[PDB]
């Protein structure tokens, strides 16, 4: 009678407490697993981002490398031409300073001087390789500059 | 006489203009090559950074993966135990609700109820795996709960 | 008559040569611009990849940091409990070695010994925090171990 | 007597079992904390790598962008000049095809034709901007080409 009433009351209390404990345990398990899985998905996204960036960076590395090598090649070439030009120009100027008589054709000298001025003033803002072609003419004029 | 004086003046002008053009061309070549080389060194640093990050990310990916798998394993296990417990608890409570006479030992019932309360209240902030061991006792008490 | 025929022939030749030069110049301009634009799109993709990875890495950094701090906290705590336990255990063993008469309750001693064995053998593969709760019982048993 | 001998034996067993359990717990705590700390150091290295790469990538992005804009500018300019040239060339060729009498100076026509050939054959491997200067001469020659 009253023993059964107490049994029912206690069974009810245990039912409620057990379902509370059950929901609590399940929620905490789900939450910690969610934290782990979310950190894992973020690490995976970061690794895939690194892989994509590494591919694009092999690409950009090849581009920047061949560009730098191209510029180095053309720069060394035009520096070599510049040094040959400077050598012969110094030679001729020394010949003028040494000899007391005429050494060079004044027409060719004035033309070469004005050409040098034009070239130097085109070099103020465009690239330096747009000048390489003119370095031929200079050479030519330095070769026909002396009286001969 | 004056022809030689004019030759010297023009040679001087050409010397100065040529060295100006020379320094200008060399400076612009050096500057553009410096831009190319600096962009190349930065691209190389970026590629090496991507490689280092990719290695560290393989590492962190393995760590986060085995952690998530560990949590998933233990969570499924404790969920299975929870479902067995809930099954037998529902069975016993239904037996109480169905029969008009006593069904369970009230001492064991009160002990199991208070244990469930203790467990649910330990689960409020520590992990969920620290509870797995207690799930044994619950099971034991659910097996000796009915009058038999 | 023949002057006009030659004019037509030369105009035709110039038309063809001009369209050839035109297509050549346009193709080379388009190709170099394509190289520049493709390297630019790859650099942009790499930068965006780095940004996404940096965000995901702030996330993973926070996760790994709070996990390491949690483990350090609980490890220092359980190490402190272990050192208190070791202190009292050494104290009691020295009391046994020093006094020629009984010092401890043999029942409690055997129970504590078997509990230590159970605990050490559960620690062979699960975490170390699943043991923290048992460290209470040990303490309790070390406090009621001496004859008093 | 024998009670004390048994007490000593049991104290010895408990000492050894306790130090075994102690070393075991400490080793597992240290190992799991080491795993967490190592994953944390790797995540930190990866984040710092991403930051360095992002800086270098802002740099390379600026470089590649200004290069592409420079090429686009000069390409549109030389395309505009090419289209003006093609317009006047088509106009003159149509005048030749329409009128039954002479239309252009044959000397200028032959010179312009050979210049176009030289230019088209220089464009087989160097850049397309090294040609921009010659596009002036062409224009000039197309303006003095007709009999006037």
UniProtKB/Swiss-Prot annotation, chains A, B, C, D:
Compartmental location: Mitochondrion inner membrane
Superkingdom of this protein's organism: Eukaryota
Coiled coil (residue ranges): 79-101
Subunit structure: Component of the mitochondrial contact site and cristae organizing system (MICOS) complex.
The protein's role, per its UniProt record: Component of the MICOS complex, a large protein complex of the mitochondrial inner membrane that plays crucial roles in the maintenance of crista junctions, inner membrane architecture, and formation of contact sites to the outer membrane. Plays a role in keeping cristae membranes connected to the inner boundary membrane. Also promotes protein import via the mitochondrial intermembrane space assembly (MIA) pathway.
Family: Belongs to the MICOS complex subunit Mic60 family.
Official protein name in the record: MICOS complex subunit MIC60
Gene transcribed to yield this protein: MIC60
Whole-protein coverage range: 235 to 382 of 527
